[PDB]
Each structure stands twice: as structure tokens, then as C-alpha cells.
Amino acid sequence: MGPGFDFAQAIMKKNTVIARTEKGEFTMLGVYDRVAVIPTHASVGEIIYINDVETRVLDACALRDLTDTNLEITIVKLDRNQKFRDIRHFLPRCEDDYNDAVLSVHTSKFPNMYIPVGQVTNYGFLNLGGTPTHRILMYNFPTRAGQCGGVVTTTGKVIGIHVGGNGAQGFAAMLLHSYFT
Secondary structure, eight states: OOHHHHHHHHHHHHHEEEEEETTEEEEEEEEEBTEEEEEGGGOOOSEEEETTEEEEEEEEEEEEOTTOOEEEEEEEEEOOSSOBOOOGGGSOSSOOOEEEEEEEEOSSSSTTEEEEEEEEEEEEEEEETTEEEEEEEEESSOOOTTOTTOEEEETTEEEEEEEEEOSSOEEEEEOOGGGGO
16 A cells, blocks of 8 residues: 555565464465574474475574574574575564554465554563564554564565464564574
């Protein structure tokens, strides 16, 4: 409907796949080559389904900060026959607050879903499902089950992936350029 939705759509149409684990179906953001991200609660194993095709996992790393605190991002390298468009130049270099973000989801349950979430706070610490988690972004939108792995964008930047909510607020794990060197 506007330039924010334009940027979000451009990312969704080229840089997402539907990932299925034993814990559910998730929006999955491809970043470059065969490297993608997913929330760590997806519990990626040795095999994952990508757009309903059985795919070997070549590597999976659940990221933690240098305080040894959960970040809720898993970086996955996929044994896929096709590379993602390289979008690492859209990743922020530092922790930050944002205006006028969009959360975009594409699954069987919610195809072609876009949500204008407004202001995004650098929230920092969150007890996420009982797990201390750092680098959390917050937005004041009542997100629901099915939106985990959703991509959070502003015009020009891919800033996070949705990892939870409390009924009134939604929470995303930051994406930083330094995770994908």
C-alpha cells in the first residue's frame, strides 16, 4: 500500500521459503548462498522440509551473545540446489530503534500476510518462554501463533525475525550484519 510494504514484498518474493520442522511451519529468511535463519525454538535437526521438499541440513548454529545468553536465532546452511539473492547489505550493523516497521509472514496458515507494526523499541532483555534472551526488538501489535520467523523490515533494512509475543506486544530477535560474515 506504501513504500514500506513495497520493501517488505520485495524481500518476501525472493528471500523466503516455508520451513517445516517437528515443531511446526515457519517463515524462513534466506540471507545469502544457501544460508537462512529461523527461530531457535523451531528445533532444527539433520533434515528439514523447505517448500515441502526433504532437505539435508549441512550446518545449524543456535547463536548466543558473548554473555553466553540466548539470541533465539539459528543460522542454517541448507543442502539446496539454488542460492538466495544476497541481502546482507540490508542488515543493520548495530543495535537500534526503528520507525514504521512491517512484519511479513508466508506459511500455509498465513500466505502473503503483511502487518504495519509501527514503532520498534530496542527492548534488550526478555524472559522468552522462561529463557533469558538478549537483543530483543518490541512492537505494540497483538501477534499470534503462526507468525514466528516472520520478517521485520523498514524501508531499506531487514532488522529482525519474529520470535514471540505476550498477547499485546510482539518480539523479534535482531539481525546484525556481523552474524553473516
